[PDB]
Amino acid sequence: TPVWNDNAHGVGSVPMHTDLELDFSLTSSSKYTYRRKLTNPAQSIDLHIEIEEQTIGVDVHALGHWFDGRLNLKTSFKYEYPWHTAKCHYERDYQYEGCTACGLYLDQLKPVGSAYKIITIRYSRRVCVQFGEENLCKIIDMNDCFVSRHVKVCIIGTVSKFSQGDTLLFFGPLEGGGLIFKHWCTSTCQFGDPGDIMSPRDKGFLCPEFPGSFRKKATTPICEYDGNMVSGYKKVMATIDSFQSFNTSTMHFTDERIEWKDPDGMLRDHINILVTKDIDFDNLGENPCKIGLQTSSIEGAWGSGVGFTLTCLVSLTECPTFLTSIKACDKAICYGAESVTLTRGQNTVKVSGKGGHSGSTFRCCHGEDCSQIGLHAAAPHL
Amino acid sequence: TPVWNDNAHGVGSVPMHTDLELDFSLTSSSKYTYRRKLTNPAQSIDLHIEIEEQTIGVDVHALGHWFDGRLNLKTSFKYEYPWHTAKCHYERDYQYEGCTACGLYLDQLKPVGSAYKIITIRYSRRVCVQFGEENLCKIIDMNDCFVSRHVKVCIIGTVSKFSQGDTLLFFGPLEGGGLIFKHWCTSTCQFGDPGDIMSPRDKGFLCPEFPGSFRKKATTPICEYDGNMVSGYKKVMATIDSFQSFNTSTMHFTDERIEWKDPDGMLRDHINILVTKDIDFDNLGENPCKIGLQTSSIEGAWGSGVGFTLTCLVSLTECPTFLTSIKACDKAICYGAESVTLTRGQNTVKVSGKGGHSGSTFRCCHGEDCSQIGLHAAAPHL
Amino acid sequence: TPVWNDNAHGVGSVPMHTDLELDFSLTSSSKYTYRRKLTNPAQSIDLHIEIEEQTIGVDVHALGHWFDGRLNLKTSFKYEYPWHTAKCHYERDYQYEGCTACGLYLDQLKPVGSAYKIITIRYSRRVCVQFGEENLCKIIDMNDCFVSRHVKVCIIGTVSKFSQGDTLLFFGPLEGGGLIFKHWCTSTCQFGDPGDIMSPRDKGFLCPEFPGSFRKKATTPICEYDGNMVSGYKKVMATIDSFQSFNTSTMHFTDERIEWKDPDGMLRDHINILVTKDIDFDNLGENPCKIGLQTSSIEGAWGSGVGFTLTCLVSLTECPTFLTSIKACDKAICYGAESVTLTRGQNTVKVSGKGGHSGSTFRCCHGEDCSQIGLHAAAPHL
Ligand SMILES: *[C@@H]1O[C@H](CO[C@H]2O[C@@H](C)[C@@H](O)[C@@H](O)[C@@H]2O)[C@@H](O[C@@H]2O[C@H](CO)[C@@H](O)[C@H](O)[C@H]2NC(C)=O)[C@H](O)[C@H]1NC(C)=O
Ligand SMILES: *[C@@H]1O[C@H](CO[C@H]2O[C@@H](C)[C@@H](O)[C@@H](O)[C@@H]2O)[C@@H](O[C@@H]2O[C@H](CO)[C@@H](O)[C@H](O)[C@H]2NC(C)=O)[C@H](O)[C@H]1NC(C)=O
Ligand SMILES: *[C@@H]1O[C@H](CO[C@H]2O[C@@H](C)[C@@H](O)[C@@H](O)[C@@H]2O)[C@@H](O[C@@H]2O[C@H](CO)[C@@H](O)[C@H](O)[C@H]2NC(C)=O)[C@H](O)[C@H]1NC(C)=O
Ligand SMILES: [K+]
Ligand SMILES: [K+]
Ligand SMILES: [K+]
Ligand code: NA
């Protein structure tokens, strides 16, 4: 007969047994403080609420640096091309009757920015509530709720600035801001594209294609190339106003993740705060079920839009069944979650996730509780 | 003087005459159940609420299968090319002083997945409410409300995973999941692009372009082609981690539509449930207006991002005017809606819609009531 | 000790001291009216609320007209090409032993539509509230709240139809509707792309690239070109159902901005209206701080996805500190905002914005109050 469920984050209330409601639209980039002494219609309760500015957390794959460069054309006339040491090149031989060779190569290379592929975007605010001698702080994700015996704080919002798959480019001492690219080259990079010339890891260029053709023109042959000769950096700069900038504040780069506070004050979210002074709220997720967790296996990749899957062994006691969520987390960041009705005893639960880095150990978690160890996922782009 | 309007789905309440509020953030992929006996401060009322998991419904155009293949180059030397039977080919003749022909053709073709263009995305939850001997179930769209005399259930949420225009690729026995492509080729498909080699309907390939050039190189000429030789499937697989996967559960494919439950447990929506035990809510859309409906004509297409327009003849009685919505629906799925202030008597109302398939008969509907017949739209991509 | 903050738009209420709540999901394209006489459990208060249809305001850059055309190939044999007057052309000379010239040129040019790049998208509803002899109307942005002593109206919603960076194409007497393009050419335009042939300002074509190659074939040489010969307009029309249409009503074009009401009746937003008859709401943004404003400088561009930055000199009196927002606005439209904790006396505040046109004078604003003059930003695409 029981059907315990902790996936509901919120409260049941009797509107006549509630004492205070705060309901408002708040600038995303602003904090908010509320302080009041709650008195009886000779004992007072101190209420102190602090809501911090909206933070964005983006799980990314670092793509390395984008480069500007010049495309050079050379003519030579077995026996190797004069330009052979160039990493990025294209050639055609005209031979017989040794050869007579046309070559293209990139040179005057210079890094212009660092690029990051968006894997996941999540917004949150840190919320702290003191009610009497109770003090509790929690990072509340947008579209989730802070729940306590006497106070509920729900945040509801939407933002459409960034999308999964976008590429963020930072031109310099990041902070300040960057550009969003919606069409950074991936499966085909041709010279001229945004993202054309990349160095994924300081060494090794991923060279673009040169889709055009050579031609040979009473003396010496002269080579011509009839494709595009303008680098992607130059083409983008020539129409820079076509691209979308964003600004940042208090940036924090870590491996495969960027967090910051977006200072765009045009954005708002909705905050609702409900307080009951006497009779406790009915916590909708209250239950007597107890969960033990450990990892079993993992497959897939960090830093990947495809992602990974963490297999968890989950033990349920004190309930016949329990509808809940099992998460894949490491160091207080969660990368995926699976809603599941557990049955009493052992359960096997697969959790699909995305994000993290080579050093991540993805743990099986329930609420704030996690397994003793996590598992590493595989590298992407092998 | 009257200005009846049923476009407001919700209630007016006196907060002191309300008995229970449930307010919470719920895991999108989780159900929720609430059961309580409502008692007087010796007669009890059974309250039973069942909210089902979020479902996504996507109106799509089935694009057929994407293929891998190999690009082959041949040299021949009136009188037809040795490779002439290949559906996808490209040739250049070098003649005079019969010809001497260079050819490219695709072969070793193999279907790798089924592709679907997103036309419309809608999320919903089925909500069932028992209050006493009243029992009512309704599919509630995200950002709409369930309304009854004693209970309101509103769902508010946002999801940004899928966008109109995205292409979904399913690699195998769909269920499990798929990939999202944001740049599947449409107006120009070149060999190497995602979507390059398609078969829209099991027969007939839509062949990609081959943008490169041929060249002819003491004996026989040998042809060369200087464009890309790697298929789009291979190029995408080589950088697969650049693309975004999604997972699915309890899939249901129908013609030009896919429905499933997304098991991503990181997503949440907001649920508000308000209950009045005694005095009925004021239903904000209550009215005495009566509507009769029939179709008049249709133009445009199913399976199209451009869409169709259904013209409806709508009769209004019992009101001088009525602000309401007229919808284009078939088999309990609605594909478009027009808000309109009807005037007493006959009205002509045009409803713009998107989606459906060749067998769809788009009917004129108001609320749960529809015309006796619907009209077929035209096919896309003719 | 004080920490005044006006970034919270909303109210604190005691639920037992509130008299009426309206909560509902409203068709985006519908208005809503509520009229009631508020009576004591012999004096009545007239309540009259009018909510107007959702309006979209899009800051854009007008891209000029897109053209259809025909690609013509000519052979000629110092001394200028027969086709030299064509604005869009491509040539290769085959010379020595004067030249023998192959040329391509565009002709039969015809404008097919007007294109606009989306810079910013904002939705709003006009809300008017009469409570007794108080009457107040305000344009309320989605996810903001109307706040007065006796009535709060909050709008919460999300729409995903348009994105920053999309290109809107209007084919004719705009109104009716248009097409959305997610991949309009920017940094590289090749013949065949959406956006290939543009005229930014009635004179001057921005010509596309012709990435293919010429070749020369007992008499006269004949030129061939092996690249794409089909215009972008024709290629798009050939697969028009792949693109997304939208409809419009009561359009209003101004320089670099378009406003309209989207008649898509499938879209809804959420409206909450709370009324207290007797004791005034606690306005969460109430404060005694007083602000003076003037511009100091500006940099950056109108009509640009990169944007501008307006530097404001802001004087704070009557408070030691004040957390608020300073905006960049002109003629009752705001283009950016910065949340800031001002300190008593002078402050320098930088406000990042996007949008506007050459005639815009961006002013420093707080609430409904603005500086006496604004500053012009620079043109984009110079
Ligand atoms: C959720 O999806 C993952 C992802 O794997 C799928 O990705 C799709 C894009 C598509 O390519 C499909 O063919 C592919 O299976 C599933 O994980 C995969 O499962 C298969 C079969 O068990 C394994 O062979 C893969 O190694 C494995 N990959 C990863 C990264 O885990 C997963 O099964 C699916 N369901 C759940 C509950 O996570
Ligand atoms: C809503 O838009 C449709 C779509 O038709 C428009 O699509 C735009 C993308 C653009 O190309 C524009 O030129 C085009 O008209 C309108 O329907 C069309 O209306 C015209 C004129 O009556 C007819 O000739 C078309 O056949 C018709 N097409 C379809 C599919 O119905 C429609 O009028 C407009 N308004 C409403 C209220 O639906
Ligand atoms: C908010 O961002 C703007 C935009 O300028 C940045 O844009 C990024 C896309 C990237 O290219 C980065 O290199 C670039 O600085 C900042 O404005 C710029 O600031 C610099 C340094 O002071 C000036 O040299 C530029 O002229 C100026 N441009 C504009 C349009 O204002 C701005 O500083 C930043 N911060 C704030 C608070 O607005
Ligand atoms: K080439
Ligand atoms: K070609
Ligand atoms: K060329
Ligand atoms: Na070529």
Author numbering:
A (entry chain A), B (entry chain A), C (entry chain A): 6 to 46, 50 to 85, 93 to 112, 128 to 247, 251 to 415
What wording appears in the published article?
We describe here the X-ray structures of Gc from Hantaan virus, the type species hantavirus and responsible for HFRS, both in its neutral pH, monomeric pre-fusion conformation, and in its acidic pH, trimeric post-fusion form. In particular, hantavirus Gc inserts residues from three different loops into the target membrane to drive fusion, as confirmed functionally by structure-guided mutagenesis on the HPS-inducing Andes virus, instead of having a single “fusion loop”.
As in the other class II proteins, the post-fusion form shows a drastic re-orientation of domain III such that it packs laterally against the domain I/II junction of both, the same and the adjacent subunits in the trimer. Of note, in crystals of rGc also at pH 6.5 obtained in the presence of KCl at concentrations above 200 mM, Gc was in its post-fusion form but the tip was disordered. The crystal-packing environment was not responsible for the observed disorder, as the crystals were isomorphous, having the same symmetry and the same cell parameters, and diffracting to high resolution (around 1.4 Å). Tyr105 directly precedes the di-carboxylate 106-EXD-108 motif, and as it adjusts its orientation to chelate the K+ ion, it alters the main chain such that Glu106 is pulled away from the interaction with Asp108, becoming de-protonated and now accepting hydrogen bonds from the imidazole ring of His104, while still maintaining the interaction with the indole ring of Trp98. These results therefore indicate that formation of the carboxylate-carboxylic acid hydrogen bond is essential to the organization of the tip of domain II, and that the reason why this region is disordered in the neutral pH structure is that this interaction cannot form.
